[PDB]
Amino acid sequence: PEHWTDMNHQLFCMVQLEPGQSEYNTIKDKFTRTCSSYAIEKIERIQNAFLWQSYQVKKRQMDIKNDHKNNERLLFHGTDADSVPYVNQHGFNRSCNAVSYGKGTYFAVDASYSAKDTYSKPDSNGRKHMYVVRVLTGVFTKGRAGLVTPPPKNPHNPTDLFDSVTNNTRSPKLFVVFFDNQAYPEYLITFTA
Amino acid sequence: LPEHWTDMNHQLFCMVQLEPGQSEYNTIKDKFTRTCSSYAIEKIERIQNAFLWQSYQVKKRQMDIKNDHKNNERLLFHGTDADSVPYVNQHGFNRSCAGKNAVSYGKGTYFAVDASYSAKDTYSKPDSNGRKHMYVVRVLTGVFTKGRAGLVTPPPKNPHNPTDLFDSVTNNTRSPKLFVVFFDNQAYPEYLITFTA
Ligand SMILES: COc1ccc2c(=O)[nH]c3sccc3c2c1
């Protein structure tokens, strides 16, 4: 509830951003950093009170666990149009492509990666969909195929887990998280090639 | 955090051994022995997990707002293997780890009305010392329907509104004996029963 606009006591609303204003410009710049050849049709702010409450609880918990670190990253997730309503209302669900770094939900550092047709599948009118996502990446390690949770931070204590996994710890391009409410879909970009 | 919990002194997790003669022990033992009178309880431990409890209580408040005057919470049983007890105590019930049930009503975490069901060796596997383990679990069953093997999420209430979902599924709406839940923090492991033949 920062840039959020009044919901008239609704628990969910999608708010189309005004082009040229501060917020729209901030999100468009994140995308055009690597996707400047695309065409943005609109950016929508996702105001989902329940998803936000659940996410903020996990953030407070991870801030306490990781004795004061920035546990949050702003990442991208391409989806097909038929998945957009579900994610808007319910967020990202690992139980719903290639799971090379584990059976989790995947998020890209670069819009360009999420802009692949394999992730942001064009609909019948050629429109592609990509979320801008607050992700609790926390303390992370290299993933591997078949993980169902992150590995332990010390194998001597096998329930004290990493927060997420990546392809490459030193220069990450993707992150996988394995729990509900570790990812908040903040904006939806509708765009074309 | 509930006022009856042991003071945990800045720590986020503790198991508390209950005393026979306490109402708290006696009620869990009666709920268990109702259908498992042939088994014998070694101990009942109260699970105090601050973070699990916070996430669960947030999901309960949301369901109590969404559903309007529904009894959304049931106290149910879950049999566990000894090797899984440390993970459940710390992190709760993860659908991605769940076994395939003999009668599947969906891919999620299963919870039994009757301790007898959870007491089967298939769920509460005897450890190397012949100890079996069963959780007593606060489950947000909410509004439910008969499930089906294909489900990875609860089904929609209405096929023309795919995102407005049942809270859980059962084997039988008229006479429910099991409940399946498909999301994290919909189940709080409240008590661990250690028992033997
Ligand atoms: C392998 O790394 C990625 C990186 C980014 C993405 C993404 O944006 N959307 C989707 S949808 C299923 C897989 C992915 C994915 C996977």
From Swiss-Prot, chain B:
Domain PARP catalytic positions: 1-197
Effect seen on changing residue 78 to Y: Abolishes catalytic activity
Annotated compartments: Nucleus
Function: Mono-ADP-ribosyltransferase that mediates mono-ADP-ribosylation of target proteins. Acts as a negative regulator of transcription.
Family: Belongs to the ARTD/PARP family.
Stated name of the protein: Protein mono-ADP-ribosyltransferase PARP15
Protein species of origin: Homo sapiens (Human)
Gene that encodes it: PARP15
Span within the parent record: 482 to 678 of 678
